[PDB]
mmCIF file with all atom_site columns, C-alpha atoms in Angstrom:
data_model
loop_
_atom_site.group_PDB
_atom_site.id
_atom_site.type_symbol
_atom_site.label_atom_id
_atom_site.label_alt_id
_atom_site.label_comp_id
_atom_site.label_asym_id
_atom_site.label_entity_id
_atom_site.label_seq_id
_atom_site.pdbx_PDB_ins_code
_atom_site.Cartn_x
_atom_site.Cartn_y
_atom_site.Cartn_z
_atom_site.occupancy
_atom_site.B_iso_or_equiv
_atom_site.pdbx_formal_charge
_atom_site.auth_seq_id
_atom_site.auth_comp_id
_atom_site.auth_asym_id
_atom_site.auth_atom_id
_atom_site.pdbx_PDB_model_num
ATOM 1   C CA . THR D 1 1   ? -12.683 18.702 30.807 1.00 0.00 ? 1   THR D CA 1
ATOM 2   C CA . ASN D 1 2   ? -13.168 16.586 27.668 1.00 0.00 ? 2   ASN D CA 1
ATOM 3   C CA . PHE D 1 3   ? -15.822 14.255 29.165 1.00 0.00 ? 3   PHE D CA 1
ATOM 4   C CA . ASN D 1 4   ? -19.521 14.753 29.876 1.00 0.00 ? 4   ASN D CA 1
ATOM 5   C CA . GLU D 1 5   ? -19.158 14.048 33.592 1.00 0.00 ? 5   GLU D CA 1
ATOM 6   C CA . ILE D 1 6   ? -21.944 12.279 35.457 1.00 0.00 ? 6   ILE D CA 1
ATOM 7   C CA . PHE D 1 7   ? -21.480 11.874 39.197 1.00 0.00 ? 7   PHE D CA 1
ATOM 8   C CA . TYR D 1 8   ? -23.638 9.322  40.942 1.00 0.00 ? 8   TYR D CA 1
ATOM 9   C CA . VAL D 1 9   ? -21.919 9.426  44.363 1.00 0.00 ? 9   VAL D CA 1
ATOM 10  C CA . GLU D 1 10  ? -22.607 10.517 47.967 1.00 0.00 ? 10  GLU D CA 1
ATOM 11  C CA . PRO D 1 11  ? -21.351 14.085 48.674 1.00 0.00 ? 11  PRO D CA 1
ATOM 12  C CA . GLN D 1 12  ? -18.732 12.779 51.164 1.00 0.00 ? 12  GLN D CA 1
ATOM 13  C CA . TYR D 1 13  ? -17.093 10.930 48.282 1.00 0.00 ? 13  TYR D CA 1
ATOM 14  C CA . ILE D 1 14  ? -17.150 13.793 45.728 1.00 0.00 ? 14  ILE D CA 1
ATOM 15  C CA . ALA D 1 15  ? -13.410 14.457 46.428 1.00 0.00 ? 15  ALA D CA 1
ATOM 16  C CA . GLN D 1 16  ? -12.457 10.945 45.240 1.00 0.00 ? 16  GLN D CA 1
ATOM 17  C CA . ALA D 1 17  ? -14.691 11.239 42.160 1.00 0.00 ? 17  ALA D CA 1
ATOM 18  C CA . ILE D 1 18  ? -13.047 14.557 41.225 1.00 0.00 ? 18  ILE D CA 1
ATOM 19  C CA . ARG D 1 19  ? -9.544  13.098 41.671 1.00 0.00 ? 19  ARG D CA 1
ATOM 20  C CA . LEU D 1 20  ? -10.287 10.035 39.494 1.00 0.00 ? 20  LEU D CA 1
ATOM 21  C CA . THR D 1 21  ? -12.117 12.046 36.809 1.00 0.00 ? 21  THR D CA 1
ATOM 22  C CA . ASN D 1 22  ? -9.092  14.411 36.698 1.00 0.00 ? 22  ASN D CA 1
ATOM 23  C CA . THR D 1 23  ? -6.746  11.416 36.358 1.00 0.00 ? 23  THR D CA 1
ATOM 24  C CA . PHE D 1 24  ? -8.562  10.133 33.257 1.00 0.00 ? 24  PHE D CA 1
ATOM 25  C CA . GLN D 1 25  ? -8.167  13.458 31.416 1.00 0.00 ? 25  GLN D CA 1
ATOM 26  C CA . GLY D 1 26  ? -4.702  11.972 30.714 1.00 0.00 ? 26  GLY D CA 1
ATOM 27  C CA . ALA D 1 27  ? -6.255  9.456  28.273 1.00 0.00 ? 27  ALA D CA 1
ATOM 28  C CA . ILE D 1 28  ? -7.420  12.231 25.862 1.00 0.00 ? 28  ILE D CA 1
ATOM 29  C CA . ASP D 1 29  ? -5.239  12.762 22.734 1.00 0.00 ? 29  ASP D CA 1
ATOM 30  C CA . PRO D 1 30  ? -4.184  16.451 22.765 1.00 0.00 ? 30  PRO D CA 1
ATOM 31  C CA . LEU D 1 31  ? -4.865  16.916 19.039 1.00 0.00 ? 31  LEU D CA 1
ATOM 32  C CA . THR D 1 32  ? -7.784  14.713 17.922 1.00 0.00 ? 32  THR D CA 1
ATOM 33  C CA . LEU D 1 33  ? -9.319  14.820 21.407 1.00 0.00 ? 33  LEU D CA 1
ATOM 34  C CA . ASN D 1 34  ? -10.105 11.155 20.970 1.00 0.00 ? 34  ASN D CA 1
ATOM 35  C CA . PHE D 1 35  ? -9.974  8.784  23.963 1.00 0.00 ? 35  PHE D CA 1
ATOM 36  C CA . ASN D 1 36  ? -6.905  6.562  23.998 1.00 0.00 ? 36  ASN D CA 1
ATOM 37  C CA . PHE D 1 37  ? -7.798  3.071  25.313 1.00 0.00 ? 37  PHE D CA 1
ATOM 38  C CA . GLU D 1 38  ? -4.183  2.006  25.764 1.00 0.00 ? 38  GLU D CA 1
ATOM 39  C CA . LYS D 1 39  ? -3.443  5.144  27.798 1.00 0.00 ? 39  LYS D CA 1
ATOM 40  C CA . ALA D 1 40  ? -6.634  4.745  29.855 1.00 0.00 ? 40  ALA D CA 1
ATOM 41  C CA . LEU D 1 41  ? -5.502  1.212  30.719 1.00 0.00 ? 41  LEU D CA 1
ATOM 42  C CA . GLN D 1 42  ? -2.016  2.487  31.660 1.00 0.00 ? 42  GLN D CA 1
ATOM 43  C CA . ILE D 1 43  ? -3.695  5.046  33.949 1.00 0.00 ? 43  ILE D CA 1
ATOM 44  C CA . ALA D 1 44  ? -5.943  2.370  35.510 1.00 0.00 ? 44  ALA D CA 1
ATOM 45  C CA . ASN D 1 45  ? -2.804  0.227  36.084 1.00 0.00 ? 45  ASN D CA 1
ATOM 46  C CA . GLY D 1 46  ? -1.152  3.046  38.027 1.00 0.00 ? 46  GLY D CA 1
ATOM 47  C CA . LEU D 1 47  ? -4.019  3.580  40.456 1.00 0.00 ? 47  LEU D CA 1
ATOM 48  C CA . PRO D 1 48  ? -3.583  2.433  44.072 1.00 0.00 ? 48  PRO D CA 1
ATOM 49  C CA . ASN D 1 49  ? -6.034  -0.046 45.636 1.00 0.00 ? 49  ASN D CA 1
ATOM 50  C CA . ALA D 1 50  ? -7.741  -0.430 42.259 1.00 0.00 ? 50  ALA D CA 1
ATOM 51  C CA . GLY D 1 51  ? -8.818  -3.045 39.717 1.00 0.00 ? 51  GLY D CA 1
ATOM 52  C CA . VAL D 1 52  ? -10.401 -3.155 36.276 1.00 0.00 ? 52  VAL D CA 1
ATOM 53  C CA . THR D 1 53  ? -13.805 -4.890 36.219 1.00 0.00 ? 53  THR D CA 1
ATOM 54  C CA . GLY D 1 54  ? -14.588 -4.562 32.512 1.00 0.00 ? 54  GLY D CA 1
ATOM 55  C CA . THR D 1 55  ? -13.386 -3.227 29.180 1.00 0.00 ? 55  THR D CA 1
ATOM 56  C CA . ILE D 1 56  ? -14.488 -2.847 25.573 1.00 0.00 ? 56  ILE D CA 1
ATOM 57  C CA . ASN D 1 57  ? -12.629 -1.564 22.513 1.00 0.00 ? 57  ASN D CA 1
ATOM 58  C CA . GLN D 1 58  ? -14.522 -2.374 19.328 1.00 0.00 ? 58  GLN D CA 1
ATOM 59  C CA . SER D 1 59  ? -17.367 -1.519 16.993 1.00 0.00 ? 59  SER D CA 1
ATOM 60  C CA . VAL D 1 60  ? -20.753 -2.118 18.583 1.00 0.00 ? 60  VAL D CA 1
ATOM 61  C CA . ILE D 1 61  ? -23.176 -0.921 15.900 1.00 0.00 ? 61  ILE D CA 1
ATOM 62  C CA . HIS D 1 62  ? -22.834 -1.017 12.117 1.00 0.00 ? 62  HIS D CA 1
ATOM 63  C CA . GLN D 1 63  ? -26.229 -0.953 10.470 1.00 0.00 ? 63  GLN D CA 1
ATOM 64  C CA . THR D 1 64  ? -29.455 0.865  9.798  1.00 0.00 ? 64  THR D CA 1
ATOM 65  C CA . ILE D 1 65  ? -31.083 1.105  13.217 1.00 0.00 ? 65  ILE D CA 1
ATOM 66  C CA . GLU D 1 66  ? -33.656 3.097  15.094 1.00 0.00 ? 66  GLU D CA 1
ATOM 67  C CA . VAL D 1 67  ? -31.955 5.417  17.550 1.00 0.00 ? 67  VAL D CA 1
ATOM 68  C CA . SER D 1 68  ? -34.035 4.051  20.507 1.00 0.00 ? 68  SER D CA 1
ATOM 69  C CA . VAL D 1 69  ? -33.028 0.434  19.680 1.00 0.00 ? 69  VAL D CA 1
ATOM 70  C CA . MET D 1 70  ? -29.380 1.519  19.485 1.00 0.00 ? 70  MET D CA 1
ATOM 71  C CA . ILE D 1 71  ? -29.650 3.219  22.904 1.00 0.00 ? 71  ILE D CA 1
ATOM 72  C CA . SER D 1 72  ? -31.159 0.018  24.412 1.00 0.00 ? 72  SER D CA 1
ATOM 73  C CA . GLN D 1 73  ? -28.323 -2.063 22.935 1.00 0.00 ? 73  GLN D CA 1
ATOM 74  C CA . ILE D 1 74  ? -25.669 0.300  24.352 1.00 0.00 ? 74  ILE D CA 1
ATOM 75  C CA . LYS D 1 75  ? -27.350 0.229  27.799 1.00 0.00 ? 75  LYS D CA 1
ATOM 76  C CA . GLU D 1 76  ? -26.935 -3.550 27.776 1.00 0.00 ? 76  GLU D CA 1
ATOM 77  C CA . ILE D 1 77  ? -23.290 -3.224 26.716 1.00 0.00 ? 77  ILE D CA 1
ATOM 78  C CA . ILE D 1 78  ? -22.690 -0.791 29.612 1.00 0.00 ? 78  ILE D CA 1
ATOM 79  C CA . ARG D 1 79  ? -24.364 -3.300 31.979 1.00 0.00 ? 79  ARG D CA 1
ATOM 80  C CA . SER D 1 80  ? -21.731 -5.853 30.819 1.00 0.00 ? 80  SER D CA 1
ATOM 81  C CA . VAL D 1 81  ? -18.735 -3.490 30.950 1.00 0.00 ? 81  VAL D CA 1
ATOM 82  C CA . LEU D 1 82  ? -19.564 -2.306 34.479 1.00 0.00 ? 82  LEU D CA 1
ATOM 83  C CA . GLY D 1 83  ? -18.782 -5.777 35.898 1.00 0.00 ? 83  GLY D CA 1
ATOM 84  C CA . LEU D 1 84  ? -20.796 -4.756 38.988 1.00 0.00 ? 84  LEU D CA 1
ATOM 85  C CA . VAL D 1 85  ? -24.566 -5.121 39.436 1.00 0.00 ? 85  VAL D CA 1
ATOM 86  C CA . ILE D 1 86  ? -26.159 -1.761 40.272 1.00 0.00 ? 86  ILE D CA 1
ATOM 87  C CA . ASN D 1 87  ? -29.822 -2.279 41.212 1.00 0.00 ? 87  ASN D CA 1
ATOM 88  C CA . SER D 1 88  ? -30.745 1.467  41.358 1.00 0.00 ? 88  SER D CA 1
ATOM 89  C CA . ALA D 1 89  ? -33.339 2.560  38.783 1.00 0.00 ? 89  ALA D CA 1
ATOM 90  C CA . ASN D 1 90  ? -32.108 6.109  39.201 1.00 0.00 ? 90  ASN D CA 1
ATOM 91  C CA . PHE D 1 91  ? -28.488 5.143  38.456 1.00 0.00 ? 91  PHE D CA 1
ATOM 92  C CA . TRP D 1 92  ? -29.696 3.405  35.297 1.00 0.00 ? 92  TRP D CA 1
ATOM 93  C CA . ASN D 1 93  ? -31.800 6.546  34.519 1.00 0.00 ? 93  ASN D CA 1
ATOM 94  C CA . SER D 1 94  ? -28.570 8.604  34.656 1.00 0.00 ? 94  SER D CA 1
ATOM 95  C CA . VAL D 1 95  ? -26.908 6.130  32.306 1.00 0.00 ? 95  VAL D CA 1
ATOM 96  C CA . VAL D 1 96  ? -29.773 6.037  29.771 1.00 0.00 ? 96  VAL D CA 1
ATOM 97  C CA . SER D 1 97  ? -30.136 9.848  29.750 1.00 0.00 ? 97  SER D CA 1
ATOM 98  C CA . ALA D 1 98  ? -26.386 10.114 29.039 1.00 0.00 ? 98  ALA D CA 1
ATOM 99  C CA . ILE D 1 99  ? -26.589 7.516  26.200 1.00 0.00 ? 99  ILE D CA 1
ATOM 100 C CA . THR D 1 100 ? -29.653 9.354  24.768 1.00 0.00 ? 100 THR D CA 1
ATOM 101 C CA . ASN D 1 101 ? -27.767 12.663 24.777 1.00 0.00 ? 101 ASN D CA 1
ATOM 102 C CA . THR D 1 102 ? -24.897 10.966 22.874 1.00 0.00 ? 102 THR D CA 1
ATOM 103 C CA . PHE D 1 103 ? -27.168 10.640 19.787 1.00 0.00 ? 103 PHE D CA 1
ATOM 104 C CA . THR D 1 104 ? -29.996 13.188 20.310 1.00 0.00 ? 104 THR D CA 1
ATOM 105 C CA . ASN D 1 105 ? -30.493 16.689 21.748 1.00 0.00 ? 105 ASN D CA 1
ATOM 106 C CA . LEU D 1 106 ? -27.267 17.458 19.842 1.00 0.00 ? 106 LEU D CA 1
ATOM 107 C CA . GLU D 1 107 ? -28.327 21.020 18.914 1.00 0.00 ? 107 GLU D CA 1
ATOM 108 C CA . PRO D 1 108 ? -27.857 22.435 22.519 1.00 0.00 ? 108 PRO D CA 1
ATOM 109 C CA . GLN D 1 109 ? -24.609 20.454 22.889 1.00 0.00 ? 109 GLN D CA 1
ATOM 110 C CA . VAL D 1 110 ? -23.130 21.558 19.573 1.00 0.00 ? 110 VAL D CA 1
ATOM 111 C CA . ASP D 1 111 ? -20.232 23.575 21.052 1.00 0.00 ? 111 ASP D CA 1
ATOM 112 C CA . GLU D 1 112 ? -19.621 21.548 24.225 1.00 0.00 ? 112 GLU D CA 1
ATOM 113 C CA . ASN D 1 113 ? -16.140 20.217 24.959 1.00 0.00 ? 113 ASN D CA 1
ATOM 114 C CA . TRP D 1 114 ? -17.269 16.593 25.213 1.00 0.00 ? 114 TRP D CA 1
ATOM 115 C CA . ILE D 1 115 ? -18.367 16.420 21.561 1.00 0.00 ? 115 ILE D CA 1
ATOM 116 C CA . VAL D 1 116 ? -15.809 16.687 18.741 1.00 0.00 ? 116 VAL D CA 1
ATOM 117 C CA . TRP D 1 117 ? -17.098 17.218 15.207 1.00 0.00 ? 117 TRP D CA 1
ATOM 118 C CA . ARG D 1 118 ? -14.963 15.491 12.516 1.00 0.00 ? 118 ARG D CA 1
ATOM 119 C CA . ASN D 1 119 ? -16.381 14.800 8.988  1.00 0.00 ? 119 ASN D CA 1
ATOM 120 C CA . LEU D 1 120 ? -19.298 17.069 8.088  1.00 0.00 ? 120 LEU D CA 1
ATOM 121 C CA . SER D 1 121 ? -20.028 16.221 4.448  1.00 0.00 ? 121 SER D CA 1
ATOM 122 C CA . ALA D 1 122 ? -23.288 16.322 2.485  1.00 0.00 ? 122 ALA D CA 1
ATOM 123 C CA . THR D 1 123 ? -23.733 12.563 2.956  1.00 0.00 ? 123 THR D CA 1
ATOM 124 C CA . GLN D 1 124 ? -22.169 11.820 6.361  1.00 0.00 ? 124 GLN D CA 1
ATOM 125 C CA . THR D 1 125 ? -21.440 13.181 9.829  1.00 0.00 ? 125 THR D CA 1
ATOM 126 C CA . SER D 1 126 ? -18.798 11.813 12.164 1.00 0.00 ? 126 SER D CA 1
ATOM 127 C CA . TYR D 1 127 ? -18.009 12.807 15.729 1.00 0.00 ? 127 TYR D CA 1
ATOM 128 C CA . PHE D 1 128 ? -16.433 11.757 19.042 1.00 0.00 ? 128 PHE D CA 1
ATOM 129 C CA . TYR D 1 129 ? -18.562 11.799 22.206 1.00 0.00 ? 129 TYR D CA 1
ATOM 130 C CA . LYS D 1 130 ? -17.132 11.214 25.680 1.00 0.00 ? 130 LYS D CA 1
ATOM 131 C CA . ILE D 1 131 ? -18.836 10.449 28.972 1.00 0.00 ? 131 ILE D CA 1
ATOM 132 C CA . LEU D 1 132 ? -17.353 9.744  32.427 1.00 0.00 ? 132 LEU D CA 1
ATOM 133 C CA . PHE D 1 133 ? -19.396 8.147  35.188 1.00 0.00 ? 133 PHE D CA 1
ATOM 134 C CA . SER D 1 134 ? -18.342 8.150  38.831 1.00 0.00 ? 134 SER D CA 1
ATOM 135 C CA . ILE D 1 135 ? -20.429 5.696  40.773 1.00 0.00 ? 135 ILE D CA 1
ATOM 136 C CA . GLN D 1 136 ? -20.785 5.011  44.473 1.00 0.00 ? 136 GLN D CA 1
ATOM 137 C CA . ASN D 1 137 ? -23.793 3.602  46.312 1.00 0.00 ? 137 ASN D CA 1
ATOM 138 C CA . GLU D 1 138 ? -24.928 0.509  48.257 1.00 0.00 ? 138 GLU D CA 1
ATOM 139 C CA . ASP D 1 139 ? -24.081 -1.792 45.318 1.00 0.00 ? 139 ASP D CA 1
ATOM 140 C CA . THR D 1 140 ? -20.472 -0.577 45.091 1.00 0.00 ? 140 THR D CA 1
ATOM 141 C CA . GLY D 1 141 ? -19.838 -1.390 48.785 1.00 0.00 ? 141 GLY D CA 1
ATOM 142 C CA . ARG D 1 142 ? -16.331 -0.406 49.908 1.00 0.00 ? 142 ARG D CA 1
ATOM 143 C CA . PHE D 1 143 ? -15.536 0.984  46.419 1.00 0.00 ? 143 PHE D CA 1
ATOM 144 C CA . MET D 1 144 ? -16.059 3.736  43.873 1.00 0.00 ? 144 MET D CA 1
ATOM 145 C CA . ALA D 1 145 ? -16.407 2.726  40.225 1.00 0.00 ? 145 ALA D CA 1
ATOM 146 C CA . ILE D 1 146 ? -15.157 5.006  37.434 1.00 0.00 ? 146 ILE D CA 1
ATOM 147 C CA . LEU D 1 147 ? -16.406 4.334  33.898 1.00 0.00 ? 147 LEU D CA 1
ATOM 148 C CA . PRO D 1 148 ? -14.895 6.504  31.105 1.00 0.00 ? 148 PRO D CA 1
ATOM 149 C CA . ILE D 1 149 ? -16.729 5.891  27.830 1.00 0.00 ? 149 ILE D CA 1
ATOM 150 C CA . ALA D 1 150 ? -15.757 7.213  24.371 1.00 0.00 ? 150 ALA D CA 1
ATOM 151 C CA . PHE D 1 151 ? -17.744 6.737  21.172 1.00 0.00 ? 151 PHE D CA 1
ATOM 152 C CA . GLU D 1 152 ? -16.594 7.274  17.576 1.00 0.00 ? 152 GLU D CA 1
ATOM 153 C CA . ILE D 1 153 ? -19.837 7.824  15.705 1.00 0.00 ? 153 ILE D CA 1
ATOM 154 C CA . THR D 1 154 ? -20.340 7.973  11.939 1.00 0.00 ? 154 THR D CA 1
ATOM 155 C CA . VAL D 1 155 ? -23.889 8.390  10.607 1.00 0.00 ? 155 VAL D CA 1
ATOM 156 C CA . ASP D 1 156 ? -25.320 8.821  7.076  1.00 0.00 ? 156 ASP D CA 1
ATOM 157 C CA . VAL D 1 157 ? -27.112 12.065 8.005  1.00 0.00 ? 157 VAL D CA 1
ATOM 158 C CA . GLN D 1 158 ? -25.929 15.577 7.236  1.00 0.00 ? 158 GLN D CA 1
ATOM 159 C CA . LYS D 1 159 ? -25.154 17.654 10.361 1.00 0.00 ? 159 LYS D CA 1
ATOM 160 C CA . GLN D 1 160 ? -28.061 20.134 10.162 1.00 0.00 ? 160 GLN D CA 1
ATOM 161 C CA . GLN D 1 161 ? -30.592 17.288 10.253 1.00 0.00 ? 161 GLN D CA 1
ATOM 162 C CA . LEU D 1 162 ? -28.553 15.299 12.822 1.00 0.00 ? 162 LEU D CA 1
ATOM 163 C CA . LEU D 1 163 ? -28.833 18.263 15.222 1.00 0.00 ? 163 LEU D CA 1
ATOM 164 C CA . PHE D 1 164 ? -32.549 17.453 15.396 1.00 0.00 ? 164 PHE D CA 1
ATOM 165 C CA . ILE D 1 165 ? -32.564 13.651 15.124 1.00 0.00 ? 165 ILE D CA 1
ATOM 166 C CA . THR D 1 166 ? -34.841 11.890 17.670 1.00 0.00 ? 166 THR D CA 1
ATOM 167 C CA . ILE D 1 167 ? -34.973 8.522  19.405 1.00 0.00 ? 167 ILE D CA 1
ATOM 168 C CA . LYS D 1 168 ? -37.715 7.465  16.918 1.00 0.00 ? 168 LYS D CA 1
ATOM 169 C CA . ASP D 1 169 ? -35.620 8.191  13.809 1.00 0.00 ? 169 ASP D CA 1
ATOM 170 C CA . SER D 1 170 ? -33.488 5.617  11.999 1.00 0.00 ? 170 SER D CA 1
ATOM 171 C CA . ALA D 1 171 ? -30.199 6.038  10.194 1.00 0.00 ? 171 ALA D CA 1
ATOM 172 C CA . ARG D 1 172 ? -27.147 4.073  9.234  1.00 0.00 ? 172 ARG D CA 1
ATOM 173 C CA . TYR D 1 173 ? -24.821 4.147  12.242 1.00 0.00 ? 173 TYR D CA 1
ATOM 174 C CA . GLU D 1 174 ? -21.290 3.061  12.699 1.00 0.00 ? 174 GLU D CA 1
ATOM 175 C CA . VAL D 1 175 ? -20.385 3.265  16.403 1.00 0.00 ? 175 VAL D CA 1
ATOM 176 C CA . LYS D 1 176 ? -17.012 2.293  17.941 1.00 0.00 ? 176 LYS D CA 1
ATOM 177 C CA . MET D 1 177 ? -16.912 2.110  21.723 1.00 0.00 ? 177 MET D CA 1
ATOM 178 C CA . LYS D 1 178 ? -13.916 2.297  24.037 1.00 0.00 ? 178 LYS D CA 1
ATOM 179 C CA . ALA D 1 179 ? -14.651 1.929  27.732 1.00 0.00 ? 179 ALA D CA 1
ATOM 180 C CA . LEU D 1 180 ? -13.289 0.532  30.973 1.00 0.00 ? 180 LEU D CA 1
ATOM 181 C CA . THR D 1 181 ? -14.592 0.239  34.523 1.00 0.00 ? 181 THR D CA 1
ATOM 182 C CA . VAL D 1 182 ? -12.075 0.684  37.321 1.00 0.00 ? 182 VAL D CA 1
ATOM 183 C CA . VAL D 1 183 ? -12.984 0.246  40.981 1.00 0.00 ? 183 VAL D CA 1
ATOM 184 C CA . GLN D 1 184 ? -10.879 1.850  43.728 1.00 0.00 ? 184 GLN D CA 1
ATOM 185 C CA . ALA D 1 185 ? -11.238 1.390  47.494 1.00 0.00 ? 185 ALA D CA 1
ATOM 186 C CA . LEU D 1 186 ? -13.117 4.318  48.997 1.00 0.00 ? 186 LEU D CA 1
ATOM 187 C CA . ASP D 1 187 ? -11.603 7.248  50.462 1.00 0.00 ? 187 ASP D CA 1
ATOM 188 C CA . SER D 1 188 ? -11.092 7.472  54.158 1.00 0.00 ? 188 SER D CA 1
#
């Protein structure tokens, strides 16, 4: 499992979520453990009864920014990439918690499979961070939505300090985002 998996589905649909999450493991490079956008799109293309409702594959932050402001920006990007309107405050809570844990609370996550440390110099830290949402509720109707998200994050903070960075801190971030939303007809 190379993704931080976040299931927001009814229990009766957990099977489908597991299947689709398993399927997207195939987009992980075996060596770098980066997320491969092209491969994720190939995988999406092969799925039955499915369509892609949004994608992104580009840099989304490249500046000095407060971590909270960055998180808010990425929430709005996720809103766009979803290509579905989910009204649930709790769903959006799940999303924002996951985005927050991409940049903060890194100390407890240091050895988790979903984070990949790369450059760890005196002047810079870079890492990959991967999240996978499965989503099914009233606003997905007859469908489940699957949203794999990978970030490539470079920040001008040395690792030891980054492990304790908070939403109120600022630093110079370079963040590349690769994501797609695929919807598949529910599971009978």
